[PDB]
Amino acid sequence: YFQSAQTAITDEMLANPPAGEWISYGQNQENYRHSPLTQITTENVGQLQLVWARGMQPGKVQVTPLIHDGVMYLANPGDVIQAIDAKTGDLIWEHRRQLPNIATLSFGEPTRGMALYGTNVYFVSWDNHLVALDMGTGQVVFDVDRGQGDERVSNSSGPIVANGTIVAGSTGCFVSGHDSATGEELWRNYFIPRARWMTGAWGQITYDPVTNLVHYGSTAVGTLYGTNTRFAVRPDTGEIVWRHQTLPRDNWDQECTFEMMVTNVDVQPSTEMEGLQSINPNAATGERRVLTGVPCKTGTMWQFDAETGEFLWARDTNYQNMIESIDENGIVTVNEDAIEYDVCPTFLGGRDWPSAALNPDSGIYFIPLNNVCYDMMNTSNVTKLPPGKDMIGRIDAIDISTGRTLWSVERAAANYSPVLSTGGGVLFNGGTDRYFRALSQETGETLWQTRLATVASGQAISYEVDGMQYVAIAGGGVSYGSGLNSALAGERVDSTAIGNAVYVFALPQ
Amino acid sequence: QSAQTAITDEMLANPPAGEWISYGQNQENYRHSPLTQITTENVGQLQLVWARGMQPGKVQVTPLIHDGVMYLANPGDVIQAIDAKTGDLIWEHRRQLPNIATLNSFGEPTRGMALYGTNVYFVSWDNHLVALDMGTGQVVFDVDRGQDERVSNSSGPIVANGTIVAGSTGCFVSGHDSATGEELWRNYFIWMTGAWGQITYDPVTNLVHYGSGTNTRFAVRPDTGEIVWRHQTLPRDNWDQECTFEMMVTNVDVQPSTEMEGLQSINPNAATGERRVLTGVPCKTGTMWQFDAETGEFLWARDTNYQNMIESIDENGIVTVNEDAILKELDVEYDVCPTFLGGRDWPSAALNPDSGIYFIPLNNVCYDMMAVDQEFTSMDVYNTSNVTKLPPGKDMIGRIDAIDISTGRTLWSVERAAANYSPVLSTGGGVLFNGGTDRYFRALSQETGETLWQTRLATVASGQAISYEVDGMQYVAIAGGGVSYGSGLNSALAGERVDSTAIGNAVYVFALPQ
Amino acid sequence: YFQSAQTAITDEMLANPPAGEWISYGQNQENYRHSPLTQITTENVGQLQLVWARGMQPGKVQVTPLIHDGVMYLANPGDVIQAIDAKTGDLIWEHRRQLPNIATLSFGEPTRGMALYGTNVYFVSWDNHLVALDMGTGQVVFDVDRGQGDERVSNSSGPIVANGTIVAGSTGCFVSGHDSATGEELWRNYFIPRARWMTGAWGQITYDPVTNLVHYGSTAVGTLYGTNTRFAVRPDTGEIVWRHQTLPRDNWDQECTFEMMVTNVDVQPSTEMEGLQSINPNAATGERRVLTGVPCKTGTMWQFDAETGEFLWARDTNYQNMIESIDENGIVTVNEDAIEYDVCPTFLGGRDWPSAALNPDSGIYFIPLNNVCYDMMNTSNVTKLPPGKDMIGRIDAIDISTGRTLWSVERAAANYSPVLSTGGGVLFNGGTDRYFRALSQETGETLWQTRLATVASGQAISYEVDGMQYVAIAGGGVSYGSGLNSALAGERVDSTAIGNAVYVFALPQ
Amino acid sequence: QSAQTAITDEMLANPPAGEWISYGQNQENYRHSPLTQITTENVGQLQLVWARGMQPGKVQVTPLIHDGVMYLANPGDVIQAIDAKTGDLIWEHRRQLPNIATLNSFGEPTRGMALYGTNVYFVSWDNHLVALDMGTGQVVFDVDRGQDERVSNSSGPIVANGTIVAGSTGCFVSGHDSATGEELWRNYFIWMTGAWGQITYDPVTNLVHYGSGTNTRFAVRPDTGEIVWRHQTLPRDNWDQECTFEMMVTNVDVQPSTEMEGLQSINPNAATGERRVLTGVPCKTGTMWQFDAETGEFLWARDTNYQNMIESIDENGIVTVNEDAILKELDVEYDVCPTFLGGRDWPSAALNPDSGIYFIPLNNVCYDMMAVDQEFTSMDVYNTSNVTKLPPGKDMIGRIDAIDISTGRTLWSVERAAANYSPVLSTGGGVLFNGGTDRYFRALSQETGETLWQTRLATVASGQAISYEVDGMQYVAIAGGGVSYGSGLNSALAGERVDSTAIGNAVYVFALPQ
Ligand SMILES: [Ca+2]
Numbered sequence A, C: 001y002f003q004s005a006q007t008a009i010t011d012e013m014l015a016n017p018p019a020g021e022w023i024s025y026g027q028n029q030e031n032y033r034h035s036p037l038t039q040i041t042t043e044n045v046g047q048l049q050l051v052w053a054r055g056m057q058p059g060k061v062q063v064t065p066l067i068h069d070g071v072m073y074l075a076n077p078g079d080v081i082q083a084i085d086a087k088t089g090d091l092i093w094e095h096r097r098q099l100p101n102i103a104t105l106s107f108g109e110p111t112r113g114m115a116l117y118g119t120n121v122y123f124v125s126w127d128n129h130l131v132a133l134d135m136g137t138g139q140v141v142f143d144v145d146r147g148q149g150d151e152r153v154s155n156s157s158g159p160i161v162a163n164g165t166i167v168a169g170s171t172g173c174f175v176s177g178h179d180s181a182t183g184e185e186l187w188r189n190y191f192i193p194r195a196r197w198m199t200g201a202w203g204q205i206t207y208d209p210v211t212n213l214v215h216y217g218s219t220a221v222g223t224l225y226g227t228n229t230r231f232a233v234r235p236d237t238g239e240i241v242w243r244h245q246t247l248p249r250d251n252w253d254q255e256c257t258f259e260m261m262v263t264n265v266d267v268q269p270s271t272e273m274e275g276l277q278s279i280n281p282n283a284a285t286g287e288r289r290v291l292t293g294v295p296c297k298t299g300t301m302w303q304f305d306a307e308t309g310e311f312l313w314a315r316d317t318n319y320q321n322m323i324e325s326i327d328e329n330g331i332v333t334v335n336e337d338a339i340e341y342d343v344c345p346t347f348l349g350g351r352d353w354p355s356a357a358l359n360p361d362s363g364i365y366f367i368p369l370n371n372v373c374y375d376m377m378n379t380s381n382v383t384k385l386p387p388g389k390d391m392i393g394r395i396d397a398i399d400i401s402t403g404r405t406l407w408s409v410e411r412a413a414a415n416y417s418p419v420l421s422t423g424g425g426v427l428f429n430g431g432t433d434r435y436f437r438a439l440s441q442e443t444g445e446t447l448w449q450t451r452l453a454t455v456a457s458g459q460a461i462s463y464e465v466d467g468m469q470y471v472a473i474a475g476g477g478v479s480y481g482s483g484l485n486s487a488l489a490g491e492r493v494d495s496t497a498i499g500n501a502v503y504v505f506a507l508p509q
Numbered sequence B, D: 001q002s003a004q005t006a007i008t009d010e011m012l013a014n015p016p017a018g019e020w021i022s023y024g025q026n027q028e029n030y031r032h033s034p035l036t037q038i039t040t041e042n043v044g045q046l047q048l049v050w051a052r053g054m055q056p057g058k059v060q061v062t063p064l065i066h067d068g069v070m071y072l073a074n075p076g077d078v079i080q081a082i083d084a085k086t087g088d089l090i091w092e093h094r095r096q097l098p099n100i101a102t103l104n105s106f107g108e109p110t111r112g113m114a115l116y117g118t119n120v121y122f123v124s125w126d127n128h129l130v131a132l133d134m135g136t137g138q139v140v141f142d143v144d145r146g147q148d149e150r151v152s153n154s155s156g157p158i159v160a161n162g163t164i165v166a167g168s169t170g171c172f173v174s175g176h177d178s179a180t181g182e183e184l185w186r187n188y189f190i191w192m193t194g195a196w197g198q199i200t201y202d203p204v205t206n207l208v209h210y211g212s213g214t215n216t217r218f219a220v221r222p223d224t225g226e227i228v229w230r231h232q233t234l235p236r237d238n239w240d241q242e243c244t245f246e247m248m249v250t251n252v253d254v255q256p257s258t259e260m261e262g263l264q265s266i267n268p269n270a271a272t273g274e275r276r277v278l279t280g281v282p283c284k285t286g287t288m289w290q291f292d293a294e295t296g297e298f299l300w301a302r303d304t305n306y307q308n309m310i311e312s313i314d315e316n317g318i319v320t321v322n323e324d325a326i327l328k329e330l331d332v333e334y335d336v337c338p339t340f341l342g343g344r345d346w347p348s349a350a351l352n353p354d355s356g357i358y359f360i361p362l363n364n365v366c367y368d369m370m371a372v373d374q375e376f377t378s379m380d381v382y383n384t385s386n387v388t389k390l391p392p393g394k395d396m397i398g399r400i401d402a403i404d405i406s407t408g409r410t411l412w413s414v415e416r417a418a419a420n421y422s423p424v425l426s427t428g429g430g431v432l433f434n435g436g437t438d439r440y441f442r443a444l445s446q447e448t449g450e451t452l453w454q455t456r457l458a459t460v461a462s463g464q465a466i467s468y469e470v471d472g473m474q475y476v477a478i479a480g481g482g483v484s485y486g487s488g489l490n491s492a493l494a495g496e497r498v499d500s501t502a503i504g505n506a507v508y509v510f511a512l513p514q
């Protein structure tokens, strides 16, 4: 079950990957989650067929497939790694790591996110080993332990490549650089000085090749320094260039550790920005390289200068009440009331790990959200809907230049699935209701849907083989966000958890 | 509108085109959807409308549809009612089963359930006849057939004039009350160790046909079980070549050409002109037969797949086995065709009634059978090896033969590398659907056999495709999983592997873009 | 992995089996456990070599192998049934019953004891099914349930053939006759009228073809009728011809259910019989067909008329104090003191399931025993040694004509292993100390020993292939009797439990 | 009497005949017991004295014996002291291991431990050097070598002039302090991904020999690890044919006949007359070599098993590989001999020093190696098949070649059907002991190769036979279990199976009737 090859992936390649491939977690290193491919447009997306599906191992499916040179690399729950013909669905090889039993939590935990570099596939194992497999055969190139004990420190977002260095987080409590050839540790940074869900940068890590900076976030666990903090570090040495705390007094497990994206924007924040918390009145206006996105579950969209971390603006998305205000320098003041009384949002967020996408060409950011609040208390659960809100699942389209909401669309069932932007002005998203849906980037209108065997829980991607654009997504398991459907009073949501699979769609052509 | 109607004999005898309420859509077992929205011209446009995850284990199931609901048997006797257009679960019955590997292993899959009144009927894994309320999945009646172990069911129960009837897999066939389940009769086989296959009720002649002493076909009355006629289709069987497979009752101008491919024997007398007929291939051997549906008079017989278990066939019903194929002492390469999974097996054939074309899923496959003395002592102990291989001039396993039932002549035959081992579905738009061991779900032209469209399921495409209608839209549905005996046939492919994924169990439903 | 054959076993064959075969549990149907083979004698037994061994499944090994026509039939723990070339140790076939989990209790419970009849091997499964396999292929001929529920009623001694009928006990609470071709039940007898270890005839059942009577015992659970009772029934109908209670007021779980043997003897009981409890003074003297042996753990040796159950004599073996006296008709009076105070023997007996043997030619009975008592209370356990007794393991040789002890030999380590008599005047026995030993029937002297990988826990047998006499025994697991070694103050006993195997020995020749 | 003596270098260099205190009985690794009580005349009388159950897993172990005690490594690093004459357990150390399948899989078996002072030494599965007290099994020292995962040990540590030394399986060889375990040196290989095999210390020349850049033999000083000489025995290796196998140091009148079977090359210059020598077959390939023990000057080289990985061999140490055997594109049947388990592997050879006869366990075995294009796209993906088969004219796998080390000529060669894959033991009574994949434990005549006696173990007879003495009685001991890679070779046997039982793990000890 082997291939040889080529086309060995350099740092230059990761910095300018082929339009038709998906070789970083967000396809480009600055993230975005945007396929520049254009065959599938709004006019024809309603014709999309299933080309092929393949069954995956049971467990939570949160995976972003990678495609290189016509090969799909697919991490299954339980550290089963597969390489599949990305046009036909024929298995090439499969590598099963021997585990087993009880570490950090119908089978496994997500190994969602892998990296390609040189001729290796890299992932962090359920027991915290950095592991490199050969692309051609699935054979182990190296297996190195990052922990000591053993322990119960894990990792779910996975490693990324940053200028030859392999960088990875945790779920002790640090981010670490590693040698791409040996896997030996080059540096580690902890988050918190020396004197409640997941803890310690298990979110997505973003490398910008232009400024040569790696960006990661910490979680909670004075302001409680440096909890829930965004860090911009150099990749070879881990040195810290700039930081900023996005949520100080966190009593709600809001985990400011999700993907932030680096891009060029005309910085032109509007005072009519919805959910506006604060615009720095001393910041320049005009073209600028920027770090922007929603880092925390609480839903605040921020923009910083990428390089200096100069604060630009901050703004609400989902209704929330943990944050009383943010000043002119982006210092957050938490609502001490919550730390009468309806806490919004939840510990499953307005947002959570399911990633936002950015269309770089129009500068629209698309974030999958959930309208949900806590509660003092079909059958019963801890959550409830925010005031005057009908539906739970939501996607918000926001202009990263002005901060103005372009549109905002909802459906009853919880979302809790990533979105994928494409060059054809169409946006894909799954969801807790098993639906895989195509929306218009222009309007938010649904142009196409299918329905998967399970919750449409994983990251949609897009790639090309022989001129055909493909769109793929997995795949299933039990989703924390399907439990959000308890707040729905008018309908049960059929969140089937068994039947895991990856699915690949295409124009009939 | 949304009225959820009772199912009567009569609805069973005359189904609306949009429904699939008998195992084979009609009681006569054609497996033909008369719907036409999907044609040879547009089938290429088919989209996935919805899928839904099923329980793990092997999927050999034929869903039933009635008034917008899909009723679907999952392995482990989990029964589901699913909204047929959207995939919304309506209800799910999980029957408390004692323990797996206490029951018959061959009873893991459930192929068929029956609909009657407002109940769904299945025979459990622990050999009970169970009736669930269509509205809710709550138990209406649970009735023990007897278990003194490892006796279950495979192909499902049917309705025959207000009477529930099922086989078993190990001998039994029984008739039951449709409101109570009480046993009304019992016919004994002593294959005689199982009437496990599909049972076919003709509401015209009031005759029930099942397959078995040593492979005989039986025509019994549904009220009493009284044997009206019978016929032995493979006598000295030395290869588990059961003849319990679905036979079809149809009217057809019987004018059998003497040019039948694989012609074994027609007849002197005979008749011609027709004739309500039982026909099809009942054995694993792949021999196609024809009888008078009410007398069981022999009409004609032909070969489909290559075989050599049958020497000749006299003009009256026969059979005389080829002795060259029987392993009797010793140490020599025996070539036996086909295999224990045949060229043909449970995966059902379809017949298009309008065209008179019979569509049979096959496998080009043989084995070398050698028994070799281990040279132990004290004892003459032997090892016996069955290596599977392709027949004389075949590149490909897995095939569909379309055959005219009037002439007995072959319309077309198409192959592909991977084992098929999957049922076929005929629709009124001139398209034929078939699964396969390679995960692919394909639409074929009924005219030419050409592949017009395919998609690939997450698992082996192992269950029966059906078609139905909701609000004027035609859907095509199929499941969906597990490990298949058919997958093993691919070992005969030299070098190339076929990705027969077992995990990922699901039912899928396709339709034209609306 | 198959054979065909022949030599189909009739009732006539079971009644007069070949000297060189072992086709009933005790080789002949009347039990005895005696190989009429003569090659191995006292003069040459010291030369015995290992010919072959084969590994068995883990779990308790209590098995009596069967040999027919050069084939060994061997029941492994967990209902794994093997047929092995009995001269070479080559596996022919193996049948694994699919079980699993928790029923009546390093893997399985003993399926010790199987029967051969016609061309089938019969056993009762761990979940109480009567199961018939073809001798040639290991294929299931029939599998029928004897219970209803399911339950927790099991069986460990196994079925026997009695004139075409298959008879079997339990561990609800009855003995049952079954059809040899279909396995359907023909009759069942319960033990106890309608108004604490194992309960309900899980001991060995004895069929006499001469009187056509089946003999079985009940366990405990007024005299408490009919507890701990010996029953003589007809095989086709189960009808009860005679009975006798061997231990009425049982508060010690003494289980009068072990093998009793049917033989012709010159009835000539001596008043100088050791441990003498009672001789019926009204019973005839002279040649007579008799039922004799030790049915209960408490060690009393009885003799009855086989046919009428007329009581002949009763006599102690191991020291005991549960029984105050037995009258002239064999009615037992229990010592109400125990029901100050050292209760002898134990619940693991003087005797337990490990079987006695009888040499029919000299009329000596050989019983493996254990000198052990309870206690009011190396490390610690519930047991202790009886007054003035040094060693735990013991074998007693008793004349069944006079009741007089011929000899009695002991060793420190607990015995708890069956004995096998042979025609060459040598007696085999294993033990809790891993030793497999050959004793002189004349003297009790040890003439030969080897040492097995594990406790020598199973029944030794003997058979012939091509003129060579073979002696075989298994095999291991955790033995209840190895726990008896706690009462040893001067030495630990190395009772290795892992390494299960059957072993076959022979003269070098 | 019962004095339990300390082991010094010197006792190690000059073992009493009755003891087995170095992996191969003597430091020079002959695996020869000089005891004579057991002879070719009476070995047929051998009785089982005692056995004892071992932990499950694969048994490749060589027990050590000293002053009446057997020290025995069980899989899972359970270490036992057993009374050597009776089988009474004395003590058992169970090391708390983190979790299986976190450690190197190839480290499951432990072949060797070392004795020194009053401690037993082993390298753990988790790559620690551990010293246990001979008296008790209590831990004296536990020292971590480094683990950054899946690095363990296989063949055991040795003593070399007060220095503990071991390889690994993935590169490392290291020297340690005998009282503390502290690392005293480290030699790096970058097979170079493992010096996993047996390591041979010569106390005469003070030289340690292990097998590896690309398969070279190394002679290092025990104090410092300083490489004194080296030699590459298989350069362009394309078949995992490691050369880490035991080589032997012996004095031998070097007069190599030019009639050596499988003669590759002798020499012009050379010397003759002898010479303390390193010799034996170091590769899986089965090529027998000879060097000066102190210079590593090349002397001669021959073939044992059939092979074609080696083309030719120049008169100076060579090697030049046959290119016909390297799989380079495509679609053709490659015949490569031997296999990845060779004709030779870890199972050790024995040398009788008095007779100068070298006794090597082999396997007549080859494979057909074909790579076939799957015709995927996009990608050129291949399947690669290794079917195992017998060599040109062989009926039998599994063999012992006895070869004279002075002449290089073959004394005898005997075979049997089943794979061997088991070490050999030479004794001073002129008998050779060998296990096997067929469970049989056999004594051979060193004179003729004839089988003089056998018994059958409960499992594959997979570990090394040794011999020792207690109170004047000679014992022969061997274990004892698990699943063997060698068992797979039997697939090349057509029809006949060999009963390679994996469960039943044990050590057995035999002796003459007393
Ligand atoms: Ca069958």
Ligand SMILES: [Ca+2]
Residues within 6 Å of the ligand: D194, D240, D242
């Ligand atoms: Ca290696």
